[model samples]
Target: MKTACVTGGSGYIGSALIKLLLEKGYAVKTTVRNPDDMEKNSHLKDLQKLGPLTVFRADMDEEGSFDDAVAGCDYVFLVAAPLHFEAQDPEKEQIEPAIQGTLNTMRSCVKAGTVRRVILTSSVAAVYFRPDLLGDGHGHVLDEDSWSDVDFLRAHKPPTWSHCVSKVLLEKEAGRFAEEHGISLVTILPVIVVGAAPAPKARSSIVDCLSMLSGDEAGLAMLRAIQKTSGEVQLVHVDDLCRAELFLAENATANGRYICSRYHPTLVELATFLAQKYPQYGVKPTDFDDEERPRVTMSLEKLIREGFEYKHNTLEEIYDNVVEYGKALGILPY
Candidate 1:
């Protein structure tokens, strides 16, 4: 079995990927800021039954911490991008860790000599940071080729542009470092990832689903109203993304970035499905009167050509799963 090290292995996407990798027989090593800090991440224990797992202590802001994590690993998955909320300095909190961490992780991996390929979990935010960029008949659809210009992000508020700039800079720097060091790398840019979490967290899928279901009448009404404005929002199941990661790891020649999204099902279509399937959640069917929703489709041709298949559940199914999973975990009221 090949050894793989995953950064931020306790977070949402990282957790899903770790579960899938363990089931596929990879000896996995995951990083934690402190191995003794069980309260912050006890749910990761669930992965031990799936395969061999190890937890190592490392900090992205500290120098030399990542060196031990990358040692003896065949492949490294960099998924620990910092997300800043309610911070005084968004760039200092989010951008610095994301950019500096990628540099240190990749550079250390090169120095260790045991690393082969790297899988980066970049966001679609990197491709379309400025939502206004698609205006005035330039183009509606976005793909792997499109890049979010940091200059465009700088024009916006620092807090608003933090996530977008972090991903864009991290990916660009990773590519440059890979070329300079002759390392092979692949990036997966996913749209909004939605599904049930294996464990309960105070603010995540549960809260987002609550805002959609019964939390605020105005919030639900707003979502209904927005469905009339543009095309359906692009969404991908977390499980489908996990399978895509595994496929990339097994296929040696699969290079470059791939967009992971289930682009069918417009907002109107999704609203109708959820209204029917989860009527108890008080979802209402919205009007699909706009053509802009379907105008921004993402091409899945590259992944299809690589023999990748997506097993996606409808937005209704995913919402239902989140509701039930949250209830079962005691995080939501049934």
Candidate 2:
């Protein structure tokens, strides 16, 4: 069987990618800081029972730590990233470690010689966080070609600015490495990912997702902040994301990058939709006093033309999957 190694085995996206890879009949290996950390790595145990799955102890901060996990694998998914939303020291705590970790992984891929393609997971922040375009009075539709305002983030020190810094730098550095080493690299730029990937926890995008439906003022405020900052809160289910990763891995002609998003909802539209559907939560359209502003929209034309069909087609399907996942995992009490 063709083999693949996914870095950051314990992550929300990484775990989902591993499951999909196994289902597609590929031998899958993944990396984690400590394979013995059962609680953090509990999902790997369940995934191991499905197919040929191996978890290796590889710290991203350490050079060459990923050698064992990636060795002999036909493809490697570089999905690990550090998200320090409130990092006091952005460079030392988030930027350096993240960029260094990625460089180390690429080095391992070069050493492996068997790796054909490397799938990199990046945030929509890379595309949509352009402060210059946000309030420019010119309506903007961010596509694959759009690069984020990394310089502005560096200047203003926005919340979680380090995450964006890490993402943009990671993509470029890996892009450079891939070109140098003759390895095909496809970067998947995604927004706040919703829905569960088997091991759904109350963190990352999950918490922010539920905030839209659940009766929490502070939570909704966070969503508004996202809308104001990124233009709109975009979402793509985990299943679609993992599937897209595998699709790009096998599709040789796949271009350099693609943005994956199913729904682009303004805070008002989102609150209104959720409130009308599940009035039990009592979210009102007028909740945020948010009128139709010239919002930033994500253009998935590049991805759609790629013949990659997103399973979560309708906005309803997207919310349904997340709601079911939320209830099933006890993250949403209803």
Candidate 3:
């Protein structure tokens, strides 16, 4: 059986990727910053019964920590990166670690020589980092050609700029390194991932996506910001996200960035859509009502062209999972 190495084994993407790999019959090796932290890694430990799985302890900030995990793996997935919105020191907290991790991991892939392809996880944040995206993206259709303007990021210093800066810089850095080293690299630009996860950290990310329904302050602010900006919210199920990673890894000609968002609804559309399906959650469509901003959309042309099909859960079914998981975790009242 083939083996794949995944960094950040405790995170949303990492943990989900592990389950998908094991389910698909790939022997999986993964790394977490704190492997001995049993609570965080318990799901991974339970997953060993499914197939051959090994957990490694590797911290990305420390150079060469990934060498052992990447060695002899047929595929390497770089999913470890900070997702901070507020960082006092963007360089120290966000940029450096992400860039260092990418480079170190890429270097390890080069050293191993056994890696057939590397799947790098880049978010949609990198595509629409402009402070003006909420206004109008100049009517330009968003796609792989779109890149967050680094200069604008530096000058404006937008909120979540630190994390956005890291994703944009790391993706470019990884692309350059892969090209120069002759390593096949494919990238996935996912939107806000909305689905259940086996790990606590991942579950929280999914719950945060439901702030508009839950009436949480921070999540409300986020939803309002999107509504007031472009009224566009993009989402991908965690299963679809992981499946794309596996698809890109297996497809030899799956080159360059494949934007992974499967659903794009205006903020109002989501509110009203959910209002019908989840009356118990109190998702008020009136709350989302506002003067619409310029609508922005992203393209998944390349991903479809390469024979990747998304098996998406219905919006009702998806929220049922998150809502159930949320109440179980005590984030949502039953």
Candidate 4:
């Protein structure tokens, strides 16, 4: 069986990717900051029953840290990166690790010589970082050709600028590095990946947003901010995103970036769904002016045209899985 390496295998998406790879009969090597932290790595350990699996210790800032993990791997999934929106030192904490860690991983891929392809987990943050760039006032649609205005963000330094800039820089630099090294690279840009957690404690911004409806004060505050400014939030199921990752990796002709989002629901719509689905949570009704809920669209023609089908196509299915999984993890009261 071919071997694959997944960085940040303990993370929300990485763990799901590992599970998928195991099911596909690939010998997997995954990296964690601390292999000794059994609590953090318990889900990965449980995956061993499905197939051959190995765990390695690697750090983003350490030079040559990924060499041992990438060596002799048929494919490398560079899914590990900082996703913090509010950092004390944006450059040091968010930018350097994302930019440098991507370069480091690619360098290791070159040295490995056995890697056929590398898949990167980028975000829609790379496509449209600024809210003002959402639409053309008449209407707007984003696709692979769209790019976030890194220069404008750099000059203006708005909220979440660090995270946005990091994704923009990482995606650009990784593409350039792949071309320079003559390595095959494919990037998957997902927006608001939402689904059940692979591990017990796995958490993501989407989960936090869901928690708000269940009466989390901090979560509610964050949701309000997102509702007022984020325009139309796009969502992709975690499992669907993992399937896209595997599809791009196996398809030799697949190259460049592909956007993966299944549904675009306004905050009020989401809240209404949540309240209706789980009325026991006591989620109150929320009203908003029509202008407050702007709509934005993205073209998924590239992925669909390539013959990739999404399993969870609607917001209801996505939320159903999320709520079910959240309850299983005891994060939500049933």
Candidate 5:
């Protein structure tokens, strides 16, 4: 059987991808910060039972640690991204890991002769975070082609420019690295990835839902942007995202970056949907009436042209699933 390496395999998307990879018949090797603690890393044990998976101790900051992570792998998914919520310096917390981690992973893949193609988990933040780069004014739907150039990190603001910068810069760096090495690199850019957490506590993207429900400013801004704009932002179910990842993995023709989102709903529409279905969540519909809110959308034509079809899970379905998962684990208040 072929072998695959997944970084951040203990996290949300990585864990889901591992299960999918196993189902696709790939022997998987995953990276964990610490391999000595089985209790903390036991979330992956269920997946290991499904198929072969080897966990290795690796850190992005450590120069040669990834060498063991990618050893003997035929495919690689560089999904380990730094997400520091309490850091005062966003760049220090996010930018360094994203750039260095990507470079290190790509270099290790080159050394591992068995490796063929690599899939990098990039975010939509890389494309739509900056207001200046967008020339079409407010309401411009950003696609894989658009990039975020603003340095929101220096402003010490809440939107987390470090995450966006990391993704944008990593993609640029990956392109250069791939061109020089003549290796195929596929970037999967997703917006607001939400799904069942491998662990009870969850990580990273799970916070997105929390912030949204809390009516946090950053979350409100995202929602307003979706509502005020004529353009649509894409959203994909985590399960569909895994399918996209695996499809790209198996199909040699699948090259370059692809946006994987289920559907784009306006902020007003989303608020209304949430209020009717989940009123107790305390995120009731609001009439902010902020017309100045910029709109952005992405085209799914490319993925569809490549024979990708969404399995049709509505936002209500996604919201319900997330609520159910959180409630089962005693995380949801309602």
Candidate 6:
């Protein structure tokens, strides 16, 4: 059986990737900060029944921590990342860890001499964050060729700006390592990920946005900022994102980056959808008079031309699944 290693196996996207790998009958090894943290790993326990699975404790800060988990694996998924936005030291907390962690994992794969391909879980934060940096202004749609401007973000720091910068540097460094070491690398860049997570405690940013719509003070602030500054929010379901990851891993010819997204909705439209769909949740309806909101479109031509199909095709279906999962887990009160 083919063996695969997934970093950050307990996270939302990582857990989903592990589940899909198990379903495909692959022997899976995953990393966690603590293997005995049962509460954090509860969702992964059930996946063992489907196929062979093992969990190892790995730290991004430690240079050789990933050696054991990645050894003898045919594929490695580097999905672990620090998501803190308001970190006291953004460089130490988010940027360094992301860059160092990626290098450490790639280094481990090279040491193992068995891994065929490494799939890195990058974000749309690397592609769509800074529109001002675009030479064509807002008229051009972002794709694999686009990148978030680290210089601009550094000069005018914004909340979670560190996270975007981390992704940009991570992808660039990973690409360099792959070329230098002869490792096959494919990066999947996803926008705001929505839908249910495999783990019960896993938090969804999209859900957080929905909560903002439901009158939470922090959520409202975040929603307003996203509406005014971002103009468009591109969303991709977690499952679909995982599927894209698997597709890249399996396809021999798949190279460079693939942007995974289903819908690009304005924040006003997103709020309206939530308020209309979950009336019981008390999400306020929003109407904006400014019809000239900047429109940032994302091209899926690469993902589509590669012959992959998205299971969750619409915002309604994605949100419905998310709500169902939330209710099942008692995370949402209806």
- Alpha-carbon RMSD, candidate 4: 2.1
Better of 1 and 5 by lDDT: 5
Model 4 TM-score, all chains together: 0.93
Listed in order, each prediction's TM-score against the native is 0.86, 0.93, 0.93, 0.93, 0.86, 0.92
Clashing pairs for model 3 are: none
lDDT leader:
2
Model 4 / residue 93 / CA error / Å: 3.4
What is candidate 4's CA lDDT for residue 148?
80
Q: lDDT by residue for model 1 over 146-204, one digit each (tens)? A: 78778867676644567777888889989999988999889998866667655334244
What lDDT is reached at residue 318 by model 6? Answer: 66
Error of 1 at 171 (Å): 0.3
| Clash-forming residue pairs, model 1 | 230-293, 231-292, 231-293
**Whole-model lDDT per candidate:** 0.71, 0.82, 0.80, 0.81, 0.73, 0.81
Q: Write the per-residue lDDT of candidate 6 for residues 1-334, one digit (tens) a residue.
A: 8999999988878988899999988999999998898988988798889899999999888899999999999999999887666889888878888888889889999999999999999888788765463433354577899899999888778777898899999899989999999999999988777787777667656455456334545655655655565566677888889889989998999999999988877766777787787778765554432355555667888999989999887778667577776665565665
- TM-score-wise, the better of 3 and 5 is 3
CA RMSD (A), model 3: 2.0
Q: What's the lDDT for candidate 4?
A: 0.81
**How many backbone collisions does model 4 have?**
0
In candidate 1 the C-alpha lDDT for residue 139 amounts to 37
Per-residue CA lDDT of model 4 for 27-96, tens digit only, reads: 9999999999998889987999999989999987888899999898999999988658687888887887
Candidate 3 has its poorest 10 consecutive residues by lDDT at: 131-140
In candidate 1, what residue range of length 10 has the lowest lDDT sum?
Answer: 222-231
Residue 43 miss distance in model 5 (angstroms): 1.6
Q: Distance (Å) between predicted and true CA of 27, model 4?
A: 1.2
What's the residue-level lDDT of 325 in candidate 4?
71
lDDT of 2 by residue, 100-180 (tens): 889899999989999989888887878877877886866678899888778998999877777778888878888998898
Weakest lDDT window of 10 consecutive positions for candidate 4: 287-296
Winner by TM-score between candidate 6 and candidate 5: 6
Candidate 4: regions farther than 4 A off: 130-132, 221-227, 287-293, 328-330
